Ligand binder design. Structure first.
Ligand code: HEM
Ligand code: HEM
Ligand code: HEM
Ligand code: HEM
Lengths: 141, 146, 141, 146
């Protein structure tokens, strides 16, 4: 649903993230793979160690998809339809995992943006990531 | 929860640094703001219609302190979270009827708050260690359901 | 998302439920309040005993809303917008509870419709109730 | 899980009646069909592209039996689910990395299956009792995470 305030908030905070978006993604993936070992089950082909260039390259991929969502926030289904097919319809990704990733993303953002991660932005950002997750699991329903 | 020498090291150096007067109110405030359903339990706290309302509410910062203290206890007694939390579990389960999922959410907003406070210090290894703990406290609080 | 098969399935199974929809709702509420005592927290004004006429009257209310969704399955947000405001925006209903109710609904339906509750219909019916839940918690996001 | 004389009565009369050759395959089959992500773990089972595929798969009905037997054990030893399930928990947690939420879901599709089999016999009190049990098994399987 994402009210007009949330959109503004998500746009602002993503703005600050700017060119670090890819470094931010790679970090979020790292916090997830460590904190939540059960997610590593989907990435048995990766080297998931601290400096893995596969985690880096994948972090940028996650960051760009999110940047695409922000830029197309009033049309996310259309924007991400293809990544839905993939995630929901081909890799068959357990939905619970999208919460764990969104959580790690929020931790990464809190760790880097101490001025912009207010209560309100945190709330917006949580809603935004909940929507992106809904679209990604959309096949499932 | 188990926790290795180095995980404990990581959890214990950081916790010593924690402002136990403020963090505890930030977590609760943010829980209410981000997951508004939980406000049902705190309608006596008063003016909570906006985030600035909530964050300045003296009873919020007052109660968040009680919460932080219970976390310090679990930290004290990781080997016996269950015995440590029984009186709280009975309260939260039998009396209040809180769905255990909300224990998880408070745990996780607590982890954000520490990330927000400590920044790069809150590296991924130190996160992974705090997720264990947080999960052990949630599991313990919910015991009376089990 | 609800494919064309699911819609057909939900339409069929609801059809069979026919005039029992209200008796079915009241039963689902009963199975929920018993199985999941934590949900009783939202109904402190009810008498929740076996024959409570308040549970009956509320069961019909739940059944009708669902019947409205089925009848307007390609436009549920518009159809249920008002019940979203209520559930999400005023009673502030913990989202976890919509899963527990949908589960009890599926049990009620399995208990009464042994011919039509096949694997495929069960799958459809689960997706349908997941959508209705998403719309109801829609404020939240 | 606790279970009162009458809850046990309710759980135990019904379970005696259960076709332990078929129900156990229906639950697993329906788990795969309704929650397709879980298929990842059973890709060796083969032809699973449609529900009729899945429901007729001999290895599905074969493995659902193993599952039903583990439930009968927990029923045998409600007072010690943990000790009863340790070897399984280690498997599901350490080896397989199954997210404990899927233990809940299997529990709940198991409850549907019994509703479907036993119809009006599966009244709400008998459901409430089976939800406890199911939740105790899920909690036990997940212990190694805890
Ligand atoms: C916030 C949601 C997420 C976004 C934005 C996202 C984005 C992406 C993108 C952009 C790709 C590459 C696309 C391509 O190759 O065409 C990808 C691949 C993939 N994602 Fe995600 N993803 C997300 C969440 C998840 C989660 C929760 C997991 C599960 C642990 C996951 C598992 C996968 C897998 C296994 C692949 C293929 C990976 C590979 O081949 O290396 N994704 N994801
Ligand atoms: C991670 C778990 C949490 C911990 C550590 C915890 C700890 C505490 C503590 C210490 C008290 C003070 C009790 C006393 O004065 O003796 C309490 C009370 C309370 N908590 Fe929690 N709590 C947690 C999560 C929650 C959640 C998720 C909610 C629900 C939204 C909740 C609702 C309450 C309420 C309303 C009280 C008031 C009880 C009363 O005064 O009767 N708690 N909690
Ligand atoms: C499948 C989703 C559900 C549907 C179709 C539904 C439908 C309804 C309807 C039709 C009403 C009466 C509307 C009116 O008075 O204007 C209602 C009231 C209400 N519902 Fe739901 N509901 C659902 C799920 C939930 C859940 C999960 C709970 C939480 C335990 C819940 C809590 C409430 C509350 C407390 C009210 C007001 C009840 C009262 O005043 O007696 N609802 N619901
Ligand atoms: C309510 C909990 C469940 C119980 C009672 C349970 C019980 C069992 C039993 C008895 C075995 C046979 C192991 C042996 O031969 O010694 C097993 C294996 C297995 N289960 Fe579970 N299980 C449950 C849920 C799940 C879920 C949710 C999944 C994941 C979708 C899962 C995945 C598997 C897999 C793939 C194996 C094969 C292990 C191997 O052969 O290496 N189980 N389970």
């Amino acid at each position: 649903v994402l009210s007009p305030a949330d959109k503004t908030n998500v746009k602002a905070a993503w703005g600050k993230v700017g060119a670090h978006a890819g470094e931010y993604g790679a970090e979020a993936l790292e916090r997830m793979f460590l904190s939540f070992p059960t997610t590593k089950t989907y990435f048995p082909h990766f080297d998931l160690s601290h400096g893995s260039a596969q985690v880096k390259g994948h972090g940028k991929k996650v960051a760009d998809a999110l940047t695409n969502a922000v830029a197309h926030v009033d049309d996310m289904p259309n924007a991400l339809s293809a990544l839905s097919d993939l995630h929901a319809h081909k890799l068959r990704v357990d939905p619970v995992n999208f919460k764990l990733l969104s959580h790690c993303l929020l931790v990464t953002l809190a760790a880097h943006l101490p001025a912009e991660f207010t209560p309100a932005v945190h709330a917006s950002l949580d809603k935004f990531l909940a929507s992106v997750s809904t679209v990604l699991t959309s096949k499932y329903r | 929860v188990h926790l290795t020498p180095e995980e404990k090291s990581a959890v214990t150096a950081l916790w010593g640094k924690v402002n136990v007067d403020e963090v505890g109110g930030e977590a609760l405030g943010r829980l209410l703001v981000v997951y508004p359903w939980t406000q049902r339990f705190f309608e006596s706290f008063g003016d909570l219609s906006t985030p600035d309302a909530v964050m300045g509410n003296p009873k919020v910062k007052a109660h968040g302190k009680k919460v932080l203290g219970a976390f310090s206890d679990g930290l004290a007694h990781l080997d016996n979270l269950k015995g440590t939390f029984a009186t709280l579990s009975e309260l939260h389960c039998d009396k209040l009827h809180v769905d255990p999922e909300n224990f998880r959410l408070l745990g996780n907003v607590l982890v954000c708050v520490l990330a927000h406070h400590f920044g790069k210090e809150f590296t991924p290894p130190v996160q992974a260690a705090y997720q264990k703990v947080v999960a052990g406290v949630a599991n313990a609080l919910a015991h009376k359901y089990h």
